[PDB]
Ligand binder design. Structure first.
Ligand SMILES: [Ca+2]
Ligand SMILES: [Cl-]
Lengths: 52, 223
């Protein structure tokens, strides 16, 4: 999944956890590692909800 | 840990990795059946990994133990991160040895200027991502409350302190949360939050463990 330059990505949390979350970025789900509470914990759950 | 160095295998024997299929937070072993971490690290399905150095290679000193209880502070506030502390009970007791050892709780709070040791398997880059195999370490001073509030006005409670650097380049980072800040042989802090990592004028913020001695004791006694 390639996110174009300028796209609005998820807001980085201030906490210092490294959760793995999958977020829909336009056409496809991309993995985000950090203090993220949004998106989905399972890639397939993101994918069936992407686009949105 | 950004701007730090290699601790050396099992030299931080109270350091644990919290794993849920991957490393997501650290913690600190405080007795054979209890770990201290951050409340914001709470999730289902936690395995505690003690005795780790390289978290991606079995080196033989690991103990893998499920978290049987994961107990956030009841007054943890997920918006302000006040009371950012959690206790994890181990399903079976750790076998304490030279590589897996508890860290003493504080009897009193630490003072500004004290150099502490902060450790973890978090990101080593302040922009982009590089997660280490082996445990990383940073020596960092406790900053004054007024300096902490200058950096983070309106955001610092009595249960938080700042430690690190104001000029950038040295900090804890994502993946270090929940892990130790040890000062003078005592667990004084828990890696909690900051404005990014290793940014100018934005030191790391840590849960102030000395305020929670009674809660920790009572929680352990009652669970
Ligand atoms: Ca290992
Ligand atoms: Cl999946």
């Amino acid at each position: 999944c390639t996110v174009p330059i300028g796209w609005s990505e998820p807001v980085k949390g201030l906490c210092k956890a490294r959760f793995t979350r999958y977020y829909c970025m336009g056409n496809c789900c991309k993995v985000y590692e950090g203090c993220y509470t949004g998106g989905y914990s399972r890639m397939g759950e993101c994918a069936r909800n992407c686009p949105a | 840990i950004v701007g730090g160095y290699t601790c050396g295998a099992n030299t931080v024997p109270y350091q644990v990795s919290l794993n849920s299929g991957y490393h997501f937070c650290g913690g600190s072993l405080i007795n054979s059946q209890w770990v201290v971490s951050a409340a914001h690290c709470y999730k289902s399905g936690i395995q505690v990994r003690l005795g780790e150095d390289n978290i991606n290679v079995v080196e033989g000193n690991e103990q893998f133990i499920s978290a049987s209880k994961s107990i956030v502070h009841p007054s943890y506030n997920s918006n302000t991160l006040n009371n950012d502390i959690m206790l994890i009970k181990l399903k079976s007791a750790a076998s304490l040895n030279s590589r897996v050892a508890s860290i003493s709780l504080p009897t009193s709070c630490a003072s500004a200027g004290t150099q502490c040791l902060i450790s973890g398997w978090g990101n080593t880059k302040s922009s982009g991502t590089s997660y280490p195999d082996v445990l990383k370490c940073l020596k960092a001073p406790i900053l004054s409350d007024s300096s902490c509030k200058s950096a983070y006005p309106g955001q610092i409670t009595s249960n938080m302190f700042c430690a690190g650097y104001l000029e950038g380049g040295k900090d804890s980072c994502q993946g270090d949360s929940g892990g130790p800040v040890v000062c003078s042989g005592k667990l004084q802090g828990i890696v909690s939050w900051g404005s990014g990592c290793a940014q100018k004028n934005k030191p790391g913020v840590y849960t102030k463990v000395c305020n929670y001695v009674s809660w920790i004791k009572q929680t352990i006694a009652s669970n």
